[PDB]
């Protein structure tokens, strides 16, 4: 039960399912002490069952319990666990993550196969903690807390801060993903090349594995944090180290479109 922005309250449906149960239990205790006839106790007891039923799996047996003046079935414990939106397939086998971003992709013919164009403004957020530490070593700010204060306002960013970021990302890779991720190459690792501009630059040869075109596709960026994650990316996931289809064994990164045409 939380207060939202407006001072309004927002509450989980389980509270209403519990309230129904609690009322009926308490009423049952009262009806028993007052020695109600068997017809009345029977109605109360059967109502208690239905209340337990709605709490555990609502709609399973009988009419789904609804909030008043809405057709929406209340969301019971079973609904929380199960389904596409359930606890398992939503919060357990997949999650939203930190250190990630997304933008429109653009072709970057000049890139080497292991590279991508990464907007500098994206990289500053994605690497923000790394940038704060480095900003203290070269002194651009007295300490970590003050350095963060400088990035809050966009006009307060000086030009030495961009050079600071270049030092940070040295040799590190990022992950690019384009959904749907149909096979393991929907994610590949790239060494980012910082660019002005708001677009991600993608190497032409990897477009086939991603099934990416430039008709407006977007891709997601992720930053592997640990030395272990970074190693995994550079060795196992780097685009240049995966050149052949794991399915057929045939070359995946191969000439296409203009490249074939020219040759």
């Amino acid at each position: 039960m939380v207060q939202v922005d407006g001072g309004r309250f927002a509450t989980s449906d389980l509270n209403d399912l519990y309230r129904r149960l609690i009322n009926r239990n308490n009423r049952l205790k009262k009806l028993l002490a007052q020695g109600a006839p068997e017809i009345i106790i029977r109605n109360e007891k059967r109502m208690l069952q239905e209340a337990v039923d709605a709490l555990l799996d609502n709609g399973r047996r009988g009419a789904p319990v609804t909030n008043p003046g809405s057709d929406r079935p209340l969301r019971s414990l079973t609904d929380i666990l199960s389904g596409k939106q359930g606890r398992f397939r939503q919060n357990l086998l997949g999650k939203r993550v930190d250190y990630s971003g997304r933008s429109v992709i653009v072709v970057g013919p000049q890139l080497k196969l292991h590279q991508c164009g990464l907007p500098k403004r994206m990289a500053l957020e994605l690497f923000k903690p790394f940038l704060l530490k480095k900003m203290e070593e070269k002194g651009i700010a007295p300490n970590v807390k003050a350095a963060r204060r400088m990035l809050e306002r966009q006009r307060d960013i000086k030009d030495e801060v961009w050079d600071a970021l270049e030092e940070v990302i040295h040799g590190k890779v990022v992950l690019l993903n384009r959904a749907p991720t149909l096979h393991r190459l929907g994610i590949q690792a790239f060494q980012p090349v910082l660019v002005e501009g708001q677009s991600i630059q993608l190497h032409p040869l990897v477009c086939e594995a991603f099934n990416a075109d430039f008709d407006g596709d977007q891709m997601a960026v992720h930053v592997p944090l640990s030395s272990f994650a970074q190693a995994e990316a550079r060795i196992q996931m780097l685009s240049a180290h995966n050149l052949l289809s794991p399915a057929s064994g045939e070359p995946l990164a191969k000439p296409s479109r203009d490249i074939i045409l020219g040759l």
């Binding site: 109605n43 059967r46 109502m47 239905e50 009988g62």
Partner: peptide, 8 residues
């Protein structure tokens, strides 16, 4: 099968 109808 209908709790109201049963009670009635």
């Amino acid at each position: 099968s209908d709790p109201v109808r049963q009670y009635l």
